Amino acid sequence: KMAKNVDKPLFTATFNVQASSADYATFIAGIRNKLRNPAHFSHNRPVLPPVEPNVPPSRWFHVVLKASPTSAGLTLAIRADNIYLEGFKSSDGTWWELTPGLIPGATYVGFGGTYRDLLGDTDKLTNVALGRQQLADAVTALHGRTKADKPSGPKQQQAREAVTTLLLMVNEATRFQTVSGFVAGLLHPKAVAAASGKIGNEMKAQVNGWQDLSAALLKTDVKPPPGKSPAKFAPIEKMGVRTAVQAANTLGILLFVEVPGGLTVAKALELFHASGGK
Numbered sequence: 001k002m003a004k005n006v007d008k009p010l011f012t013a014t015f016n017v018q019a020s021s022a023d024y025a026t027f028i029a030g031i032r033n034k035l036r037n038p039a040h041f042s043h044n045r046p047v048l049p050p051v052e053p054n055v056p057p058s059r060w061f062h063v064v065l066k067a068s069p070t071s072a073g074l075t076l077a078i079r080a081d082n083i084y085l086e087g088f089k090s091s092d093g094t095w096w097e098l099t100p101g102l103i104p105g106a107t108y109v110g111f112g113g114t115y116r117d118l119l120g121d122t123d124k125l126t127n128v129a130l131g132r133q134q135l136a137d138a139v140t141a142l143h144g145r146t147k148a149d150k151p152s153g154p155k156q157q158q159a160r161e162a163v164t165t166l167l168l169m170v171n172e173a174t175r176f177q178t179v180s181g182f183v184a185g186l187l188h189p190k191a192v193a194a195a196s197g198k199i200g201n202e203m204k205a206q207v208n209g210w211q212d213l214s215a216a217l218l219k220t221d222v223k224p225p226p227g228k229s230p231a232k233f234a235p236i237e238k239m240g241v242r243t244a245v246q247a248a249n250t251l252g253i254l255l256f257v258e259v260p261g262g263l264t265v266a267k268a269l270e271l272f273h274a275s276g277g278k
């Protein structure tokens with residue numbers, strides 16, 4: 001079934017690609033803040049509300065990426081429950097989708113939104129150059145797409161790399177303080193040489209295990225039966241995350257996961273609604 005409210009975003013976050021590192025950090029933090037379930041934090045990190053059951057994805061936000069403070073932005077359509085990128089809007093007004101048949105009126109771009117779809121393998125995230133120019137070039141490539149272009153092998157490859165670039169610099173940045181901090185570290189004033197960088201294996205593991213890391217921290221919040229010890233964090237060595245404090249420093253915003261003894265989908269959504277959440 002088709003998604004609802006794709007063009008009725010709960011909020012819009014906007015970033016000028018030439019703006020400062022501080023403004024980028026502010027931009028990412030604001031996304032996390034607007035996505036949060038105000039009734040559910042873990043170690044003072046925000047947790048997303050659960051995914052709504054019995055309905056197709058009906059909660060969305062937009063990210064607008066601008067080449068400059070005056071320029072028309074590239075609009076991204078992202079789910080507000082799991083931060084999945086599913087759509088982007090080019091300058092001619094065409095909505096492109098990463099899943100065939102998901103967004104009403106949209107045109108399928110020719111490939112999917114998983115890293116296997118985009119790179120061939122999730123192990124290849126360590127090969128993707130990130131930085132200010134890569135961000136700007138990705139915005140240019142996707143924003144300039146027109147409905148009438150004849151797709152080509154090279155153009156699709158360009159489009160894949162552009163989507164991958166944005167997924168990392170927007171979506172994964174939102175999910176992980178490690179990734180957002182890394183990207184913030186690549187952004188400098190014009191007086192500084194152009195810079196680019198690739199993520200290491202720890203961040204790759206984090207990106208490929210968001211649910212696992214979210215669940216691992218959530219488990220530590222479960223109050224024990226009386227007369228027993230608080231659950232201890234189970235290390236995830238591949239992510240470089242051995243303790244709950246490290247997990248908290250790593251997680252930008254947690255995916256909601258039902259863990260034994262914790263909130264259910266229904267109860268967390270009940271608390272979300274009671275706190276004003278939409």
Ligand SMILES: Nc1ncnc2c1ncn2[C@@H]1O[C@H](COP(=O)(O)O)[C@@H](O)[C@H]1O
Nearest residue numbers: 083084085086113114167171207210211
């Ligand atoms: N369209 C997407 N946008 C952003 N992240 C995604 C997308 N699809 C998959 N992921 C990531 O891949 C993980 C596994 O997704 P799945 O294929 O649904 O099991 C998710 O938890 C996300 O971290």
